[PDB]
Amino acid sequence: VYSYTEKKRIRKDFGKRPQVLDVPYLLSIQLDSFQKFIEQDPEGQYGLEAAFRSVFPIQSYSGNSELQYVSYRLGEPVFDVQECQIRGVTYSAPLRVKLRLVIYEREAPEGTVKDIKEQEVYMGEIPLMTDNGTFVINGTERVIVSQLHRSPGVFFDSDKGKTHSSGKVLYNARIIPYRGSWLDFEFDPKDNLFVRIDRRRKLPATIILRALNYTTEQILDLFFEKVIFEIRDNKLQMELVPERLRGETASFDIEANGKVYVEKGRRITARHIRQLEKDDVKLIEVPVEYIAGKVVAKDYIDESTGELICAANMELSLDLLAKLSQSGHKRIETLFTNDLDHGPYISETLRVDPTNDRLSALVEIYRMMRPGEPPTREAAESLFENLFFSEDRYDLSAVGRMKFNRSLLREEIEGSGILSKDDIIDVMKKLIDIRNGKGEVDDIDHLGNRRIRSVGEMAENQFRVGLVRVERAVKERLSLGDLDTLMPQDMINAKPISAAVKEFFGSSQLSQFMDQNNPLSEITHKRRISALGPGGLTRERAGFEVRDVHPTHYGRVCPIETPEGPNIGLINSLSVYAQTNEYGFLETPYRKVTDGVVTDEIHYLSAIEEGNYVIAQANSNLDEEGHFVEDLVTCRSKGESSLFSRDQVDYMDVSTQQVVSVGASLIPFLEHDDANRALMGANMQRQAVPTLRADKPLVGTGMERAVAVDSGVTAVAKRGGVVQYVDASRIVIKVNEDEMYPGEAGIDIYNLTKYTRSNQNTCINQMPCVSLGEPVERGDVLADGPSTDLGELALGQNMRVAFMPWNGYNFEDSILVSERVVQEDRFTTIHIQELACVSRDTKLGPEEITADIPNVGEAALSKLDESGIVYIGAEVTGGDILVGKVTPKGETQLTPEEKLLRAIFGEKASDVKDSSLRVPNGVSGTVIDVQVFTRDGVEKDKRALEIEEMQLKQAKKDLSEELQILEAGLFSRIRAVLVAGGVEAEKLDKLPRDRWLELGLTDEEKQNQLEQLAEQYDELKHEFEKKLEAKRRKITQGDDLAPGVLKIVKVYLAVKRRIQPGDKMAGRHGNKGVISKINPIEDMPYDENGTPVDIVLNPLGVPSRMNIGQILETHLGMAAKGIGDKINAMLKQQQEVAKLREFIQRAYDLGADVRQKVDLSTFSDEEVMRLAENLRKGMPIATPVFDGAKEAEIKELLKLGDLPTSGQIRLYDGRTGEQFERPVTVGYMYMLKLNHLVDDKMHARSTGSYSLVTQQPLGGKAQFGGQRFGEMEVWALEAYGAAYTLQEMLTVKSDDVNGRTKMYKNIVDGNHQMEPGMPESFNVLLKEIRSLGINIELEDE
Template sequence: MAYSYFEKKRIRKDFGKSVQVMEYPFLLSIQLDSFRKFIDTDPTGETGLEAAFRSIFPIKAYSGSSELQYVSYRLGEPLFDVKECQIRGVTYSAPLRVKLRLVVYDKEAAAGTVKDIKEQEVYMGEIPLMTDNGTFVINGTERVIVSQLHRSPGVFFDHDKGKTHSSGKVLYNARVIPYRGSWLDFEFDPKDNLFVRIDRRRKLPASIILRALEYSTEEILAMFYDTTDYTIKGDKLIMDLIPERLRGETAIFDISIKKGEVLVESGRRITARHIRALSKAKLEKLEVPADYIVGRVLSKAYIDKSTGEVIAEANAIITLELLAELSQAGHKVLSTLYMNEFDVGSYMSDTLRVDSSTNKLEALVEVYRMMRPGEPPTKDAAEGLFSNLFFASERYDLSTVGRMKFNRRVGNADDVGTGILSKEDIISVMKTLIGIRDGKGEVDDIDHLGNRRIRSVGEMAENQFRVGLVRVERAVRERLSLGDLDAIMPQDLINAKPISAAVKEFFGSSQLSQFMDQNNPLSEVTHKRRISALGPGGLTRERAGFEVRDVHPTHYGRVCPIETPEGPNIGLINSLSCYARTNDFGFLETPYRKVIDGLVTDEIDYLSAIEEGNFVIAQANAERNDSNKLVQDLVNCRHRNEFILKASAEVQYMDVSPQQIISVAASLIPFLEHDDANRALMGSNMQRQAVPTLRVDKPLVGTGMEKVVAVDSGVTAVAKRGGVVSYVDASRIVVKVNENEMHAGEAGIDIYNLTKYTRSNQNTCINQRPVCRMGEPVVRGDVLADGPSTDMGELALGQNMRIAFMPWNGYNFEDSMLLSERVAIEDRFTTIHIQELTCIARDTKLGSEEITADIPNVGESALSKLDEAGVVYIGAEVNGGDILVGKVTPKGETQLTPEEKLLRAIFGEKAADVKDSSLRVPNSVKGTIIDVQIFTRDGVEKDARAVEIEQMQLKEVKKDLGDELSILEDGIYARTKKLLLSAGLNESDLTSMSRDKWLTQNLADEGQQAELEQIAEQFDNIKEDFDKKFEVKRRKITQGDDLQPGVLKIVKVYLAVKRHIQPGDKMAGRHGNKGVISNVVPVEDMPYDQFGVPVDIVLNPLGVPSRMNIGQILETHLGMACRGIGEKINRMLEAQQEIHKLRNFIQEVYNVGESRQVVDVASFSDDEVLRLAGNLRAGLPIATPAFDGAAEKEIKELFVLADMPQSGQFVLTDGRTGREFERPVTVGYMYMLKLNHLVDDKMHARSTGSYSLVTQQPLGGKAQFGGQRFGEMEVWALEAYGAAYTLQEMLTVKSDDVNGRTKMYKNLVDGDHRMEPGIPESFNVLLKEIRSLGINIELDKD
């Protein structure tokens, strides 16, 4: 492959063998595409806002005299951009304007005659917009809407696994689940009667639904059963014979084919052989004894023709008496239902007998009573309720997905249809359920991904928006019916509040709208690709069983089997696999390569879980020859969710990549195939907790996925178009665009403003650093600036550490790790955390709070870091307890003493009584102030500091816009100069005149003149545009802020804290090997090798075998080889060896192994080779993709190239004694992460503080400044020691003996160290509790 200038700077050697036929799809597309569908106008009206409007409008008046019609909608421009929204704490949203048409019909004229039409654009609230990175800014914080995996609408057949009834009988059921509307359940009871439930209410016989649909008993029986006719001849019966129907019966009479030839003797079972003989004999009638018909069921009613009296109802069971009656009444042919005990059960027939209703009205009343118990039913109400349940599109919708799933399941050929149920739909569900009960067909697997679909942002927002519209609809309809529509405009009918409220509620407080995990770029990407089975309409943690959580065969390539949380959510929250996407119906699809007659093509098809089961699919690593033909005769395949061996000619598809089954986080673990799944799960989860370090360091051993994550996450600045870097500083990059990528008549300059030292949701630091230099060429997609945790466009979550697996004086007992002091000194794991502290001045009942430096009872030293406005300086270094913003609050008037009254009378009004309510630095925090923002309410005077900040911001904006303008000007003048020179003017003419006049020249050539005029016009537009931009920015900065009611001023102070690594911090590798730092040891005491190089971390070797994560050992070895090669290249550079030797060595390194990567170092220029070698000094970066990584042989080859022992083990010397350890130790480089579980955040000590109200014991937890609980077990320990006095003070004065502790505090102040324990408050609580049980206990104090 051809590498760009930037990519040649550092090439990661790839050990992957299987050729990549497709790039990784954009990782955030699940979020962006879904929201785009919601926002964009859909001409078909099936998705998004358009669908919501069309489903509610037109809104007709109850009388039908007028209606409000929907025409179109548009989204306006957002008021603030994303950054401004975050600073101001507002929502990033755009106003929704809808064009509505009010049509008033003429009552006097013919129906449909229009009297008046009014059209108007109506404001319908704000719609939050998605940022380019797939997030929403809601009230200033970035949030993510997690996609939900819920049960697809449609019909599902299931059974209770024999758990409901004591006999263990399996009871089958069917459930019709709509997208919205009532659920319809059919179920069998232990007696095999079929019942129906609506919305899980009381059950009714299933035939009630059919009767309510106007079916009679005879029609119901005809739908479910075939009939057998018997003709009465004297005292004999002649049966119409269909031989197949006799299967499995026991003959109660001899069956003869011909006279004297008995085929089946009485008492024998009729078998398939007998049936074949009967069919061969072509017998159409069979004489049967009268007993044979007894117990059978009549298919229709029989009437005595002479009297009109009903002799037998349909569904009556025949007895000998009834038979005689029917025969006497002259009925010669009796039609009975064909039923047997094997495959045609009598369920519907039995159910009809249980059913008490006989006609439609009775059935409707029964349904009404069940749905609305206690209400008196009327005919209209009952009919209205029933038709609204399943047959009204406003109340019931299967959705396109539901209809497709429904039709496929019940065997309808069509995939399309209406969203409501029809009579035929209900009957087909019952027939399918009875078929399953009869042994025809299988029940559904609800955990199959063909039965679960993804609901993404767009769909959920649309549903919520529709909820808001429904609320508005009622109000509009009532308003339309009030009459007097002449003076009314559409604007007067619509109240946008309910719509805004519904949308705001969803984005602000829905269970699936989550505070974005912004620890590092990986955690952002993973959060956006998360799929949750929880949330509204989903499962609950408590009720979710093992099956739902388990990995299902259909997860293959769709949902990651590894990445899921530990704990109560395991298996309910999953992550999307690397290549997966959702289809139009919301089902997950994964790509496969087509295989034709054993030949693997590059054609790619996306298959859903439903389609996949029908195909034979080979694995990505199936052996192929050079012409891409499958080599082996038998190939390991998947078919119908089973792993089987199939002939290569039968293979229809093949996986696209070995990484297809895992998620992004899991695919970042090298040698994943050598780790136990439990540890891989921890590894994937812990990478998301890694804190971005101050100095980034790319992993030596990676997987090749690092670049994809870094670019797709949006934390890096990526070139939109190719060109040359014309300017770079810490906060801005300017690229002059290539001619061939420019649009006609534009300046051809791209400006990238970088994010500097801003706070993330998790208080980590977001900062971008340029990685390009002036004059360097860039192509589209090149990384221009690194973000947090990225190194030259690759994800870099941690640091490469030299580690040794060995015990060291017990300091690495139980997963602890020993750290060298050098790591701390070199700031390898130093991280910056930014905290936002807010001070709010409110208007109180007693007067308004004031932000000031004049604070009562505070010394000068405490105010030393504040300016005259009472706000801390930027750059001030502050400690716990320091004042950041001085604020005073009015105090209630206190009762004055006589002396005060006298003083007040003499000296006049005393300064108003105020109390200090300043914002202080939290305890145990120490840092530097990096920014201050002040927001003042409209109409409140701005203080000096606010004005100063405002001036500074205006100055920055002016400078930024001025710089941009001058860059664009330079670009335009450069193009103009080129044009004028080509038109015949010479260089000296141009330099002699001012640049402004260049644009007013007259050129002979018309085409050139037109181009010059176009440039001049464009220049004017750019200037005008910049004036507008500056004006907009100026207005935003100078105008007052829209604050919450009662808030006068908000001061936000940003505090940067530098955290060094120290004992107690949690660290981890990428293989689930986590631990806590137990000690930081001086470098000279650490074990060192024969070259005197000490190790950085000592890990416990016992942490490997039982955990079965061998990947970490392979990573350590490979890391050592990479480092060795880097050191070798470094030695060559320092010795200034000939460039061809360096080139040959680098080529040799890249040629190791049989990988898919081709790096032709010979084609690089000498400068490029030196630049590459310079970047390889710290070690050769390597990609070993999951399931396709480096083999042992290849690691050994690298060891040979690095001149190192192939065992990867070295003899180490003890740094303290100078003695060699007795056996060689595995030493190498492992990528270690510092996790966001820092000891500084957890460590806390209490001296005095607040107490719990009831027990009077100290509160618990750091947030409440609480104490450690001396619990039951600790008491036992002191009892065991016999430390009576210690125990006594622990349970009294140090805890909840109120008087004792107050007295002791006084004594200590007085220098008296005695203590007198009293009665602990918990004893009083116990007394009160016993009294609440009605037992009076009184303490005798004598």
């Protein structure tokens, strides 16, 4: 049923809700981004082929030649991931691209059969992904962080609050392209419409319409609705739709085939418009003054002569109606104007804008584009076609086109790469409808308005940039000259593409280093979603309302995961079950519920599909065989809670464990804690360093099994088998012949490498823990990593907290520890270091490495080799020679006193300088291994022989072992041939193995079989000699080194970092504090058994720091370790296995409403003994998130451990021996060790080297420096009665050279005088003032 690693040991999971299919693969986001990018597409509208279709084919200006594209392929990598982890030279894979050259003819217009050539043109390098998930770049593993930007779409925004304080509501429209000019439409407070094409200056609305060759009547026909006014010889009669007089005062008597309907002065009410709709009145007699004052639409020309009586956008008068009546134009089509409901504002824009045709519009548009140029037509028209109607220079993001069609309410999800003329009209009509009050302003913080920038999409962007950086020169070389003898191989370059790729992968602010502290922080840094990037959410203009979490982030984005301070919660991380679709949005699964019957099938929902209907939550009570319990079930309706009936429930989630990320959900008691300390828990765990030898934790979740093997830190078995050999450096396996590959025998040899370096200076071991050969299968654990014990994560280890007040030592959130933590190397972390050697050629002499160094005694040279290198494992001390180095010296120019000393004593002091590698304030330790790089031109000179034989021992000897494993089956097949050929049973074991080919049998098929066996042995020898030469060739040629440098010697260290009495280390709920000095086991309290308290915490920290999970976590740890102590007490006697079996069965059936029925009766006796040896140190508990143990279970589970339901049993004093007045809990809980180590941050200086400008006394980490003070400390010291100690800090110890020169002489002679002189930084200030060209002086006193 379960895995064999869970047959070895298993824990208790309560599970008050039944679960469906568990956590998917954790790194599916980072891997699929590439799998959609590198892998070949048959339809080809994906990956690189999208760029190769968008750019290629390229057509030159002459048109006589072009370039065509077919496909691409990838080659095999030269170096492996292990050699690129050890040394590291640009781990990638070369790209192979075939191209064809098409040259047209001069006489024929389409002579494409003139010159057709096919060859290979090199592109550059493309880095692959170590499937574990690390970008391997030159020995330093990295990743890149996924971005979070606003994406191409048409959503709206409101402009209120600060600007336009008169009280005018103004909106705006923003069209978001992908590569081009960002389109902006905004409003005006005097009821107009503005256009800001790539915003620098405002433009009217109708100029972009008149630039598209539009007239006035076409605009008035498309946008406005036209009303025809008719005249029959005496009157004015109109064709009025009756639902148009809403909110208009009637100023005349309405007589339409009956009585007077509406009185003069009465507003049109509901029954009046109802009766006018029922009567179906076609013609309404309106008076003269109603039409006189309106605006006509068409240009009503004269039929007599042809002149313009009235034009468009002209106000009517009393004489104009008489002229139109005498002219015979009885079809006055007056525009319908409704100021309350409709918008006549584009007619006001036509009133403001004086432009008439396209020629008057394009001049103003081209002057708005680039001022300082005479206006032309062809250049402006070509600029318009390349900025608005182009495809190669203007892309529009087909997913964004689908979003355009969704926002404009269309039915076609596909589109072109250019802007059509109907889209602008539709978005202006939508903007007018929003201005009229029919629309709705979309908020920015929707999840449908942000698109995930993954690895592959940003790689597509960088590939497009690097290809536009080459294709211009490609077009120039096509239009350069002759084409017959010129080949396309020497035309397309390979430097800019690969250079842009390597500079983006090694210079971008998102491409940063990893965090090799603990693998949960590794997963955190993997699936991290940032907001800052190439023009994203800059923190200077950070969204004040964007920073607040949106209510649609329920189940998509983890609400609490950020570091406090400058990197505020804008940068987040996605949740557990949520993945990304191929469009680029977030989605989460929900299960199907059909008419109350809860089925099993699940489906994914997008961002815009959540706020439409009922989404149910997991804490509702569910019943057997499908139906519900309570009639009132709370759910989520459009982002709000509601209480309703049964049949309205549409969908439902699977379980609660999803709304937080993995770093929050590893905390089992998050549901009993406040959100602030649960936010603080994430950046308390993600900087934790594991110890040397930790144990199995107590309080975990069931999701520790995922983040394990699914992270990738443990060794994963490929297909299983039987383990043949077990060692602490190498393990092998014998795969069964049923699952064996049909080609040949496959043996999974594991060349595991221990103790590799990290850039956070951590120690990594992968701890081979397997026993002798057991049958293993797919998905097992073979190597427990540096923070895992038996597969699952062992981050730290549990202590015994008795939070009780002490004599001033547990004062304000501090920690008292015992002396038993030092004895068994508990809380011991190992920090290793990396150093390097330099050796560069000079103009007087190259650098050499000799052990013979002048003016150095033999006591410091006895630790070195004959070449001058410290032995492996030699105990180093600060002030010793690490790498011996001589340096050629020039001319000796000294004082005559030292020359007199040289003349008296008589030392020659030849030109050899002492520039050997020494450690400044050397932290002592142990050298791990010395790695020395060699030079192709310079002889290696005797040093790297031993590490060369070590590289030969990790070489072919393992291949010789694999060849011996294959040779065993080969000899078995030879024996199977020789037995079946003839009767040979006693004359084969006595003869040697090599004396078998000389035996000649009869002429039959066994002679051909023996010939094929001899040819197979010769083929195995010929295959062995190839990699026998090839491994030595790779070791020889794998020494690419920086120019101008001869050789580099690496020196490692190992400190092992014992416990200092002041550190930074805490629990999991965010109570960060400082451990005080170590009190012994004698002063600290104890119990009735005699065991002293291990650790003491803050007693008043509990009600003030609002942490509740601490107490029941302590009770669970105490009860579980009491159960483990009862198991140990049963183990102390040679006891019958039957009552132990009953004990384990009752301990697994202790829960009443518990799930996960343990298949316990099928274990053998040795498996029960191994389960007892595993549960020796306590049976661990597993409580899921947002589903906790009720206190009755805690009481009945600690009553099992012989406790009177209190947990506070008789702490005795260690100083006087008395008993306390009220007892304190002596329970057990779980805590972690952090990364903030004491002397790595602590540094202090006395002297050193000074800088250039104001001599700038250097400081920092590993620089031997100190601390300055700002102007705040200046104000603080001027707040006192102190006058010139601040002035001393200003000049004397800072920049006064003669001042500190006199000061050091006063201290070394015992004078203690200050004598202030002149600050040099003020002189630098005076010179910077005089560098401008104005006078400044010092008036003499």
